[PDB]
Amino acid sequence: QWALEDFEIGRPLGKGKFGNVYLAREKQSKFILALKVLFKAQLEKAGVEHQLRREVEIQSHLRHPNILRLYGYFHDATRVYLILEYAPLGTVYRELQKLSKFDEQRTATYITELANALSYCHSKRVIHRDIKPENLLLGSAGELKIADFGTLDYLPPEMIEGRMHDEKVDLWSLGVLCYEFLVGKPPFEANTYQETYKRISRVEFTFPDFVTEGARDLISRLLKHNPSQRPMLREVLEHPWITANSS
Amino acid sequence: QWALEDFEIGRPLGKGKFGNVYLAREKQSKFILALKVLFKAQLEKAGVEHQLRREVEIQSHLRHPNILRLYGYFHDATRVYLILEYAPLGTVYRELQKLSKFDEQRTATYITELANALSYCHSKRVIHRDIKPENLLLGSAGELKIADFGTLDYLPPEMIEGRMHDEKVDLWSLGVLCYEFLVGKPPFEANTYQETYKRISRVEFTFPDFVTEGARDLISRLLKHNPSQRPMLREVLEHPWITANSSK
Amino acid sequence: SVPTKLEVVAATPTSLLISWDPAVTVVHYVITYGETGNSPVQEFTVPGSKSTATISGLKPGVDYTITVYAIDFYWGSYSPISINYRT
Amino acid sequence: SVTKLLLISWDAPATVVHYVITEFTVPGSKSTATISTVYAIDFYWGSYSPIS
Ligand SMILES: Nc1ncnc2c1ncn2[C@@H]1O[C@H](COP(=O)(O)OP(=O)(O)CP(=O)(O)O)[C@@H](O)[C@H]1O
Ligand SMILES: Nc1ncnc2c1ncn2[C@@H]1O[C@H](COP(=O)(O)OP(=O)(O)CP(=O)(O)O)[C@@H](O)[C@H]1O
């Protein structure tokens, strides 16, 4: 039974539209934590209060070193508080903006940590994990941490068209992430929402010259329209380009 | 392809969460249409602009007599406009509240109309459409019109638990509406989230004393935890209770 | 803490009429009432669409304690707010 | 019709992804167009009404 008085606030780590989050420390134990605040009014106008409460219970049955922990929650008259694990090194999105692209060693390591967490999620019957760069947090040792609490460029055609989908969705997003890490932008990015929508349905993307032959093979196997033709998560971890560059 | 000067905006037909829907008569063909005037500032503040724009793309390709048509859209510097098919008799939620419950032949006809629309959606592999009574409009001849743009009572157990799902989720929502049409409330309505989560996951619902055996047999077959045990859409149309009260 | 306000409106030799202020939809309010300081506290609920309730069956010359707390549909109950009224 | 109508400026508040000119294309961050009918392009809802 947590409350606001049990935490000592710190500097704000971020401030978006739906909410914000500060550094927090439990007063009794002085343990460093993160307190994400969400407004009930904003989540009620967009219908996210349904899926926010659903993901709060979902992520309590999941334990993985590459998935951000949720230790509890509490609320008041106008805000919703989530006690999260502190990620000191920020987001992959912000880090991608500062360096444009990642090397093959860091990219393959990110894919391995992502595929491992998704394999644990699929084993626990968890389906869709939004692995946007904004939702990928970095631990103290630089390890990736999924924090699922815009998204157009990362969803397969079966999701943007309102069709059925399964665990093969994460395989498409891995290929989009692997492309963005090495190139610097999502493969289907365009100026119009209509153009980016059609480019996803047609799988309209090209490889730049500097992309190695091993990276092109992995991305081409993942970015497939038919979900049944995409590989399985353990096939990604056994890929020669992954095992040669990951850690 | 469209602009504000192509229509003659008339009286409002009801306020929306982000704007207002008005009666619009085109300037050229003089066709009566529905114009949803959604404000950008509230679509950008709530974070639903991409959600509506995505559903606009999906709805623009589904042409069925029981689905409200999206003919096109346009926008200004601070509002978004949507050319919708005119539904004169309002929404089912309003008439479900004007009365308490529906007929047996009105419920079966509505279920038959819904099962036909979802058969057209499943043929294009398009699954999971918000068919709640608030999203159900009435045509000129009382026909059901599916419109798209709390909501936990209509979700199957595989969705509230956070698992993968197929086309059987619309078979679950079909049984929830059939119960609400005959009773007046969803079969898993509760006063809390955990109480609603427990009622849906464990399939805890009861039929009142005025529910026909043929009606409760169809609802019991559709409201099953295992999605593979849910019937086919053609089995719902070929149901004895459906074929004895429908008008298709 | 919501309900941020509370008061006894009408009152009666063996009855009470309480009222409260929320800017957020609530499922219902859990109303419980007991004498300050010795007996099990009686409990009852009032729908979240109502802003007042009636407590009857009390006893004159007794200082009661009326605590009210709302319940969020998704996040549970709020912090209670206490009040005193001597019959 | 997105408003203000060879160096031609617009000063359109809007935002705008880019401006195509009847064919060239200027970035949306710029409020002028140096040429040597304008369509304002929004990201989600596409082009605005032309002018003009
Ligand atoms: N455990 C955590 N540890 C460290 N930082 C965290 C964190 N959780 C969230 N953040 C920080 O705040 C940001 C994530 O929260 P945020 O509210 O911004 O995302 P969001 O999903 O709500 C959409 P938006 O980014 O537009 O606000 C991150 O950029 C991060 O810096
Ligand atoms: N084609 C259409 N034809 C006739 N009336 C329509 C209509 N579309 C919407 N409306 C009417 O005007 C109102 C507009 O509300 P809107 O379409 O935004 O639904 P919503 O998703 O916001 C939930 P609610 O309707 O309860 O506000 C509706 O309540 C309806 O009565």
PDB file of N, CA, C and O and ligand atoms in Angstrom, chain B residues 12-22 33-36 68-69 84-91 93-94 134-135 137-138 147-149, ligand 2:
ATOM      1  N   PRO B  12     -27.000  21.008 -36.056  1.00  0.00           N
ATOM      2  CA  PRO B  12     -26.168  19.970 -35.439  1.00  0.00           C
ATOM      3  C   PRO B  12     -26.982  18.733 -35.095  1.00  0.00           C
ATOM      4  O   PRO B  12     -28.157  18.812 -34.729  1.00  0.00           O
ATOM      5  N   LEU B  13     -26.334  17.575 -35.215  1.00  0.00           N
ATOM      6  CA  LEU B  13     -26.959  16.292 -34.925  1.00  0.00           C
ATOM      7  C   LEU B  13     -26.452  15.675 -33.628  1.00  0.00           C
ATOM      8  O   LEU B  13     -26.798  14.529 -33.322  1.00  0.00           O
ATOM      9  N   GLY B  14     -25.644  16.402 -32.861  1.00  0.00           N
ATOM     10  CA  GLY B  14     -25.131  15.889 -31.607  1.00  0.00           C
ATOM     11  C   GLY B  14     -23.675  16.229 -31.375  1.00  0.00           C
ATOM     12  O   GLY B  14     -22.873  16.230 -32.313  1.00  0.00           O
ATOM     13  N   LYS B  15     -23.320  16.518 -30.126  1.00  0.00           N
ATOM     14  CA  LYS B  15     -21.949  16.866 -29.789  1.00  0.00           C
ATOM     15  C   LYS B  15     -21.086  15.615 -29.686  1.00  0.00           C
ATOM     16  O   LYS B  15     -21.569  14.521 -29.381  1.00  0.00           O
ATOM     17  N   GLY B  16     -19.787  15.789 -29.946  1.00  0.00           N
ATOM     18  CA  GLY B  16     -18.829  14.712 -29.866  1.00  0.00           C
ATOM     19  C   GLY B  16     -17.766  14.992 -28.815  1.00  0.00           C
ATOM     20  O   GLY B  16     -17.677  16.092 -28.256  1.00  0.00           O
ATOM     21  N   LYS B  17     -16.952  13.967 -28.550  1.00  0.00           N
ATOM     22  CA  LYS B  17     -15.882  14.100 -27.568  1.00  0.00           C
ATOM     23  C   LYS B  17     -14.803  15.078 -28.010  1.00  0.00           C
ATOM     24  O   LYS B  17     -14.101  15.633 -27.157  1.00  0.00           O
ATOM     25  N   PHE B  18     -14.656  15.303 -29.317  1.00  0.00           N
ATOM     26  CA  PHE B  18     -13.659  16.227 -29.835  1.00  0.00           C
ATOM     27  C   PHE B  18     -14.234  17.254 -30.801  1.00  0.00           C
ATOM     28  O   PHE B  18     -13.467  18.044 -31.362  1.00  0.00           O
ATOM     29  N   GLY B  19     -15.548  17.270 -31.010  1.00  0.00           N
ATOM     30  CA  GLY B  19     -16.157  18.221 -31.918  1.00  0.00           C
ATOM     31  C   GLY B  19     -17.665  18.098 -31.993  1.00  0.00           C
ATOM     32  O   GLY B  19     -18.319  17.777 -30.996  1.00  0.00           O
ATOM     33  N   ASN B  20     -18.228  18.353 -33.172  1.00  0.00           N
ATOM     34  CA  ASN B  20     -19.668  18.284 -33.370  1.00  0.00           C
ATOM     35  C   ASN B  20     -19.954  17.772 -34.774  1.00  0.00           C
ATOM     36  O   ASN B  20     -19.243  18.114 -35.723  1.00  0.00           O
ATOM     37  N   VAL B  21     -20.995  16.952 -34.897  1.00  0.00           N
ATOM     38  CA  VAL B  21     -21.428  16.405 -36.177  1.00  0.00           C
ATOM     39  C   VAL B  21     -22.650  17.183 -36.642  1.00  0.00           C
ATOM     40  O   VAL B  21     -23.615  17.349 -35.885  1.00  0.00           O
ATOM     41  N   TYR B  22     -22.611  17.663 -37.882  1.00  0.00           N
ATOM     42  CA  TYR B  22     -23.687  18.459 -38.450  1.00  0.00           C
ATOM     43  C   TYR B  22     -24.255  17.772 -39.684  1.00  0.00           C
ATOM     44  O   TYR B  22     -23.645  16.865 -40.257  1.00  0.00           O
ATOM     45  N   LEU B  33     -25.572  14.400 -46.484  1.00  0.00           N
ATOM     46  CA  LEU B  33     -24.477  13.655 -45.882  1.00  0.00           C
ATOM     47  C   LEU B  33     -24.262  14.152 -44.460  1.00  0.00           C
ATOM     48  O   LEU B  33     -24.780  15.196 -44.055  1.00  0.00           O
ATOM     49  N   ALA B  34     -23.489  13.384 -43.698  1.00  0.00           N
ATOM     50  CA  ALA B  34     -23.124  13.744 -42.336  1.00  0.00           C
ATOM     51  C   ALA B  34     -21.682  14.231 -42.319  1.00  0.00           C
ATOM     52  O   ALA B  34     -20.786  13.553 -42.833  1.00  0.00           O
ATOM     53  N   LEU B  35     -21.463  15.406 -41.733  1.00  0.00           N
ATOM     54  CA  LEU B  35     -20.144  16.029 -41.679  1.00  0.00           C
ATOM     55  C   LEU B  35     -19.708  16.115 -40.223  1.00  0.00           C
ATOM     56  O   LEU B  35     -20.273  16.892 -39.445  1.00  0.00           O
ATOM     57  N   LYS B  36     -18.707  15.319 -39.857  1.00  0.00           N
ATOM     58  CA  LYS B  36     -18.156  15.326 -38.506  1.00  0.00           C
ATOM     59  C   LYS B  36     -17.052  16.374 -38.440  1.00  0.00           C
ATOM     60  O   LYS B  36     -16.001  16.220 -39.070  1.00  0.00           O
ATOM     61  N   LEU B  68     -21.606   1.952 -41.782  1.00  0.00           N
ATOM     62  CA  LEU B  68     -21.643   3.356 -42.167  1.00  0.00           C
ATOM     63  C   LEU B  68     -20.447   3.686 -43.050  1.00  0.00           C
ATOM     64  O   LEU B  68     -19.301   3.382 -42.704  1.00  0.00           O
ATOM     65  N   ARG B  69     -20.717   4.308 -44.193  1.00  0.00           N
ATOM     66  CA  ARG B  69     -19.696   4.538 -45.204  1.00  0.00           C
ATOM     67  C   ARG B  69     -18.915   5.813 -44.918  1.00  0.00           C
ATOM     68  O   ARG B  69     -19.471   6.807 -44.442  1.00  0.00           O
ATOM     69  N   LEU B  84     -19.468  11.505 -43.707  1.00  0.00           N
ATOM     70  CA  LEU B  84     -20.081  10.262 -43.267  1.00  0.00           C
ATOM     71  C   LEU B  84     -21.461  10.097 -43.889  1.00  0.00           C
ATOM     72  O   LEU B  84     -22.109  11.067 -44.294  1.00  0.00           O
ATOM     73  N   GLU B  85     -21.904   8.845 -43.958  1.00  0.00           N
ATOM     74  CA  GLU B  85     -23.255   8.554 -44.412  1.00  0.00           C
ATOM     75  C   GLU B  85     -24.265   8.998 -43.361  1.00  0.00           C
ATOM     76  O   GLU B  85     -24.060   8.809 -42.158  1.00  0.00           O
ATOM     77  N   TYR B  86     -25.358   9.600 -43.820  1.00  0.00           N
ATOM     78  CA  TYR B  86     -26.365  10.120 -42.906  1.00  0.00           C
ATOM     79  C   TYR B  86     -27.184   8.983 -42.307  1.00  0.00           C
ATOM     80  O   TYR B  86     -27.710   8.132 -43.031  1.00  0.00           O
ATOM     81  N   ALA B  87     -27.285   8.969 -40.978  1.00  0.00           N
ATOM     82  CA  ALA B  87     -28.105   8.003 -40.254  1.00  0.00           C
ATOM     83  C   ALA B  87     -29.245   8.742 -39.566  1.00  0.00           C
ATOM     84  O   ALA B  87     -29.031   9.378 -38.522  1.00  0.00           O
ATOM     85  N   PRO B  88     -30.468   8.689 -40.101  1.00  0.00           N
ATOM     86  CA  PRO B  88     -31.529   9.561 -39.564  1.00  0.00           C
ATOM     87  C   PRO B  88     -31.996   9.178 -38.171  1.00  0.00           C
ATOM     88  O   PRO B  88     -32.202  10.063 -37.332  1.00  0.00           O
ATOM     89  N   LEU B  89     -32.173   7.886 -37.895  1.00  0.00           N
ATOM     90  CA  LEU B  89     -32.799   7.445 -36.654  1.00  0.00           C
ATOM     91  C   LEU B  89     -31.824   7.347 -35.480  1.00  0.00           C
ATOM     92  O   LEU B  89     -32.087   6.589 -34.538  1.00  0.00           O
ATOM     93  N   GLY B  90     -30.715   8.085 -35.508  1.00  0.00           N
ATOM     94  CA  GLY B  90     -29.857   8.169 -34.340  1.00  0.00           C
ATOM     95  C   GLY B  90     -29.057   6.902 -34.082  1.00  0.00           C
ATOM     96  O   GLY B  90     -28.726   6.137 -34.993  1.00  0.00           O
ATOM     97  N   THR B  91     -28.739   6.684 -32.809  1.00  0.00           N
ATOM     98  CA  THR B  91     -27.909   5.574 -32.370  1.00  0.00           C
ATOM     99  C   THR B  91     -28.745   4.541 -31.624  1.00  0.00           C
ATOM    100  O   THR B  91     -29.808   4.843 -31.074  1.00  0.00           O
ATOM    101  N   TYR B  93     -27.735   3.024 -28.911  1.00  0.00           N
ATOM    102  CA  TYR B  93     -27.594   3.289 -27.482  1.00  0.00           C
ATOM    103  C   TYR B  93     -28.700   4.205 -26.974  1.00  0.00           C
ATOM    104  O   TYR B  93     -29.204   4.024 -25.859  1.00  0.00           O
ATOM    105  N   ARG B  94     -29.091   5.196 -27.778  1.00  0.00           N
ATOM    106  CA  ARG B  94     -30.171   6.090 -27.372  1.00  0.00           C
ATOM    107  C   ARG B  94     -31.506   5.358 -27.332  1.00  0.00           C
ATOM    108  O   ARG B  94     -32.298   5.550 -26.401  1.00  0.00           O
ATOM    109  N   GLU B 134     -23.318   2.179 -28.719  1.00  0.00           N
ATOM    110  CA  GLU B 134     -22.999   3.574 -29.000  1.00  0.00           C
ATOM    111  C   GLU B 134     -22.426   3.747 -30.401  1.00  0.00           C
ATOM    112  O   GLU B 134     -22.551   4.825 -30.992  1.00  0.00           O
ATOM    113  N   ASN B 135     -21.800   2.704 -30.946  1.00  0.00           N
ATOM    114  CA  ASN B 135     -21.217   2.740 -32.280  1.00  0.00           C
ATOM    115  C   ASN B 135     -22.138   2.135 -33.334  1.00  0.00           C
ATOM    116  O   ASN B 135     -21.688   1.838 -34.446  1.00  0.00           O
ATOM    117  N   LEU B 137     -25.469   2.794 -35.554  1.00  0.00           N
ATOM    118  CA  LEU B 137     -26.421   3.774 -36.052  1.00  0.00           C
ATOM    119  C   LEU B 137     -27.571   3.081 -36.772  1.00  0.00           C
ATOM    120  O   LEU B 137     -27.477   1.918 -37.172  1.00  0.00           O
ATOM    121  N   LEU B 138     -28.668   3.816 -36.931  1.00  0.00           N
ATOM    122  CA  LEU B 138     -29.869   3.317 -37.585  1.00  0.00           C
ATOM    123  C   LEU B 138     -30.041   4.010 -38.928  1.00  0.00           C
ATOM    124  O   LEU B 138     -29.934   5.238 -39.016  1.00  0.00           O
ATOM    125  N   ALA B 147     -20.694   2.263 -37.172  1.00  0.00           N
ATOM    126  CA  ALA B 147     -19.860   3.449 -37.276  1.00  0.00           C
ATOM    127  C   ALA B 147     -18.664   3.318 -36.343  1.00  0.00           C
ATOM    128  O   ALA B 147     -18.762   2.732 -35.261  1.00  0.00           O
ATOM    129  N   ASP B 148     -17.532   3.869 -36.772  1.00  0.00           N
ATOM    130  CA  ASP B 148     -16.299   3.813 -36.002  1.00  0.00           C
ATOM    131  C   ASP B 148     -15.638   5.184 -35.990  1.00  0.00           C
ATOM    132  O   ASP B 148     -15.972   6.067 -36.784  1.00  0.00           O
ATOM    133  N   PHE B 149     -14.690   5.349 -35.073  1.00  0.00           N
ATOM    134  CA  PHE B 149     -13.961   6.604 -34.936  1.00  0.00           C
ATOM    135  C   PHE B 149     -12.602   6.377 -34.281  1.00  0.00           C
ATOM    136  O   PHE B 149     -12.466   5.545 -33.383  1.00  0.00           O
TER     137      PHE B 149
HETATM  138  N1  LIG E   2     -23.852   9.685 -39.616  1.00  0.00           N
HETATM  139  C1  LIG E   2     -24.335  10.244 -38.353  1.00  0.00           C
HETATM  140  N2  LIG E   2     -25.602  10.470 -38.673  1.00  0.00           N
HETATM  141  C2  LIG E   2     -26.450  11.009 -37.754  1.00  0.00           C
HETATM  142  N3  LIG E   2     -26.000  11.314 -36.514  1.00  0.00           N
HETATM  143  C3  LIG E   2     -24.710  11.085 -36.186  1.00  0.00           C
HETATM  144  C4  LIG E   2     -23.874  10.556 -37.087  1.00  0.00           C
HETATM  145  N4  LIG E   2     -22.663  10.433 -36.510  1.00  0.00           N
HETATM  146  C5  LIG E   2     -22.753  10.884 -35.260  1.00  0.00           C
HETATM  147  N5  LIG E   2     -24.020  11.289 -35.055  1.00  0.00           N
HETATM  148  C6  LIG E   2     -24.880  11.886 -33.975  1.00  0.00           C
HETATM  149  O1  LIG E   2     -24.209  13.144 -33.388  1.00  0.00           O
HETATM  150  C7  LIG E   2     -23.414  12.646 -32.153  1.00  0.00           C
HETATM  151  C8  LIG E   2     -21.865  12.759 -32.439  1.00  0.00           C
HETATM  152  O2  LIG E   2     -21.159  11.988 -31.490  1.00  0.00           O
HETATM  153  P1  LIG E   2     -19.829  11.075 -32.012  1.00  0.00           P
HETATM  154  O3  LIG E   2     -20.019  10.666 -33.462  1.00  0.00           O
HETATM  155  O4  LIG E   2     -18.565  11.911 -31.899  1.00  0.00           O
HETATM  156  O5  LIG E   2     -19.713   9.718 -31.073  1.00  0.00           O
HETATM  157  P2  LIG E   2     -18.651   9.497 -29.826  1.00  0.00           P
HETATM  158  O6  LIG E   2     -17.624   8.482 -30.217  1.00  0.00           O
HETATM  159  O7  LIG E   2     -17.970  10.787 -29.479  1.00  0.00           O
HETATM  160  C9  LIG E   2     -19.591   8.889 -28.341  1.00  0.00           C
HETATM  161  P3  LIG E   2     -21.095   9.975 -28.065  1.00  0.00           P
HETATM  162  O8  LIG E   2     -21.977   9.946 -29.300  1.00  0.00           O
HETATM  163  O9  LIG E   2     -21.868   9.467 -26.893  1.00  0.00           O
HETATM  164  O10 LIG E   2     -20.650  11.396 -27.796  1.00  0.00           O
HETATM  165  C10 LIG E   2     -23.732  11.428 -31.975  1.00  0.00           C
HETATM  166  O11 LIG E   2     -24.141  11.225 -30.607  1.00  0.00           O
HETATM  167  C11 LIG E   2     -24.985  11.083 -32.995  1.00  0.00           C
HETATM  168  O12 LIG E   2     -26.261  11.294 -32.311  1.00  0.00           O
END
